[PDB]
Amino acid sequence: VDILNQKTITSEVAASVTSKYLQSTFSKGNTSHIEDKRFIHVSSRSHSITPNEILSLKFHVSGSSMAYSRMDGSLTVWFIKDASFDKSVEVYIPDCCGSDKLATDLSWNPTSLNQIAVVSNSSEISLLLINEKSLTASKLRTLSLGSKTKVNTCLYDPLGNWLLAATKSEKIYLFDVKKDHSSVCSLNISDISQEDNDVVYSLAWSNGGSHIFIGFKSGYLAILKAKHGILEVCTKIKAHTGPITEIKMDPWGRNFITGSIDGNCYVWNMKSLCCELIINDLNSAVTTLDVCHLGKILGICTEDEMVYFYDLNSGNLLHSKSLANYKTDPVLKFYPDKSWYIMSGKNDTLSNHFVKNEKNLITYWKDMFDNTMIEKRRK
């Protein structure tokens, strides 16, 4: 009765549907293990242990490619056109960004259909193409600048219009993308944070692509413009009492979420730039953090090795799984076009992904409605 009373999605019938979607995605027929190279190596040593955690996992904005970089060695790039995850590895590159250092961060290109930008830890950003016919990965260029000490992070603009590479001690670089990959500006981190010797932990682009959010070690949060080439500081608020771990954005452009090393996770709205909702998560330090693409599920994963699932409008809990016997740093990641997710860690350092037959939550409620309606058209 309570299904067919409301014919549009209300606040209450949405929170009861999304608690059945997360309940039915943990099942037996709705989970499959990714046939990786480490899933081959672990399954031999377990039938008959060296840890290499993953360092990044990124999705293409079309939602059709997935790349990720293990600790010791290689990049791995999967290609999914529609077949769930059993379609094709295209490439994996054992010496990807050189043969001396590691691959720390990754970013895809939103404009070009097939191009990554892998950043080492030395001083150099190597842009490389992933070939579609053959299984190879050829380079395109290699960027560098003067007074460049050690780059850690790289981010593309969500419009594909800039590139932001940052050190955690010295400086922050902008590279224009449209004309040529040329340095436009450079800002010293001591001008951003005036207090002490801070270490930049996380960064994010806004949904428009004109502001940058920077999270320090002392708990400060700086918001700084990028108009055409100028890079100046707009505000500076003190958010947490600890290092700001991760920063996310709402996909509807309403609010943004920050996490820290105390058990603390706020939801700040983007108009008035004040805190709006507080999640009471007094368990441990939040490690990873992500939202859905409809903007309703929020996945928190702390250092108690337990994952939670909240709402963004309210702050209520939907589901909770405990994964305690593993030795992972487990990574949640939601798909960008459909409402599936890929939770890392099955045995040692692995990746499973949790599927259904319906893509969204909206085409799940629309199928639950039409199955109930047949019964009321039966009586």
Partner 1 sequence: EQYCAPDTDIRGVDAQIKNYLDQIKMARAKFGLENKYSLKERLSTLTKELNHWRKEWDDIEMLMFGDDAHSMKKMIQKIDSLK
- Positions touching partner 1 (CB under 8 A) are 129, 138-142
Q: Which is nearer to partner 1, 124 or 262 (CB)?
A: 124
Q: Which residue's CB is nearer to partner 1, number 86 or number 100? A: 100
Instruction: Give the shortest CB-82-to-partner 1 separation in angstroms.
Output: 22
Q: Distances in Å between the alpha carbon of 58 and those of 36, 55, 85, 360?
A: 16, 10, 15, 21
What is the Cα–Cα distance from 302 to 305, expressed in whole angstroms? 6
Q: Which DSSP category does 362 fall into?
A: H
CA 312 to chain centre: 17
- Residue with Cβ nearer partner 1 (62 or 197): 62
Cα(84)–Cα(22) distance, rounded to whole angstroms? 18
> Do the Cβ atoms of 291 and 341 come closer than 8 Å?
no
Question: Nearest 10 degrees: CA dihedral of 231, 215, 157, 70?
Answer: 140
Identify which of 239, 274, 275, 276 has the alpha carbon closest to the alpha carbon of residue 259. Answer: 239
Q: Identify the residue whose tokens are 């509807």.
A: 252
CB 133 to partner 1: min, Å: 12
User: Of 101 and 139, which has the nearer Cβ to partner 1?
Assistant: 139
Residue 50 or 112: the one with the smaller Cβ distance to partner 1 is 112
SS3 of 276-306: the string is EEEEECCCCCEEEEEECCCCCEEEEEECCCE
Is the CB of 125 or the CB of 298 nearer to partner 1?
A: 125
Q: How far is the CB of 185 from partner 1 (least distance, A)?
A: 24
C-beta of 141: minimal distance to partner 1 in Å? 6
Token pair in block for residue 33:
């293990």
User: What 8-state DSSP symbol labels residue 279?
Assistant: E
Residue 128 or 257 with smaller CB distance to partner 1: 128
Token pair belonging to 110: 């939103």
- Shortest Å distance, C-beta 131 to partner 1: 11
Of 129 and 184, the one with the shorter C-beta distance to partner 1 is 129
- Residue 157, C-beta contacts closer than 8 angstroms, at least 6 positions apart: 110, 163, 164, 177, 205, 209
Q: Which two tokens stand for residue 93?
A: 């590159």
Triad 233, 239, 245: Cα angle to 5°: 95
